[PDB]
Design a protein around this ligand. Structure first.
Ligand SMILES: C[C@@H](O)[C@H](N)C(=O)O
Ligand SMILES: C[C@@H](O)[C@H](N)C(=O)O
Lengths: 163, 164
């Protein structure tokens, strides 16, 4: 019944790449990911939100090891010019911080307090993604310490019940 | 890479806050409002903000019966945040591929996308990690997507693990 938090994880070893302006039609994500998979880019997370109400296109962001970042840009910039994408952006100064746990679905206060914790130390949340075991956000790598510390304080974190 | 199953869910709605300012504290306003309303949040996805506008969008899923209410409780905050809007969709399906060791095998992500393309299913939202590739699609496309992924990854229906 309860949500249980088992840890706060930080990762400063990734880069994120964003492909902007993809038509929201079948097969467009396949074009991006077949190119990357053929180049052996080790993808950590992919995030694509719903397509825009003003343009109908959407953006796709993914993280990968920083050592894979320049190659992924090379592959994608080639694709960029052949098709109708707006642009491809690179960022190798991103940090990932995650609250790890279980049973968070029925406790929305866990999500609210994760955002409040980072707001209270002025850490801007650049990207959010979640799974069955984690709330993960991408922020400036220089804010990883303030962020992880704020989360440990917010949830009074070895494993803890959300209260 | 070892794949363990294809999971489907047709019990959720998705709600999207459009045009939120990309500055500290704004996601907290969204999520504190949903927590005080006791609305279960299943997945949250926010991509990067636009450099020209300084805004981004946040999408979350929740039980379908709470979707319209979640959208309307968030519309109470739209003006203060100068959001463009809050949308609700109760026709969404979620399909996921579960497995171990996907990070070192990007071919698994590419094949997931190819599978859906080859059955002409448009992917609305993507959220993946090393333990699960999840997408949101129209609920009427759920059966087609799910069968395509069983074929693509040679998975049966008994959760028998299959190496990639
Ligand atoms: C944008 C991309 O996800 C597209 N909707 C597809 O199905 O490939
Ligand atoms: C858009 C929202 O995530 C904002 N960047 C915040 O940190 O609250």
């Amino acid at each position: 019944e309860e949500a249980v938090l088992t840890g706060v994880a930080t990762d400063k070893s990734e880069a994120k790449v964003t492909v902007l302006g993809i038509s929201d039609k079948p097969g467009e994500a396949a074009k991006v990911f077949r190119a990357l998979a053929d180049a052996e880019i080790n993808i950590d997370m992919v995030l694509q939100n719903v397509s825009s109400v003003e343009d109908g296109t959407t953006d796709i962001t993914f993280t990968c090891p920083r050592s894979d970042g320049r190659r992924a840009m090379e592959i994608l910039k080639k694709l960029q010019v052949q098709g109708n994408w707006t642009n491809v952006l690179y960022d190798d100064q991103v940090g990932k911080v995650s609250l790890v746990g279980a049973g968070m679905k029925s406790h929305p206060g866990v999500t609210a307090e994760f955002m409040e914790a980072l707001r209270d130390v002025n850490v801007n949340i650049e990207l959010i993604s979640t799974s069955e075991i984690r709330i993960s956000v991408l922020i400036r790598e220089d804010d990883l310490d303030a962020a992880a510390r704020a989360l440990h304080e917010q949830f009074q974190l070895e494993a803890v019940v959300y209260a």
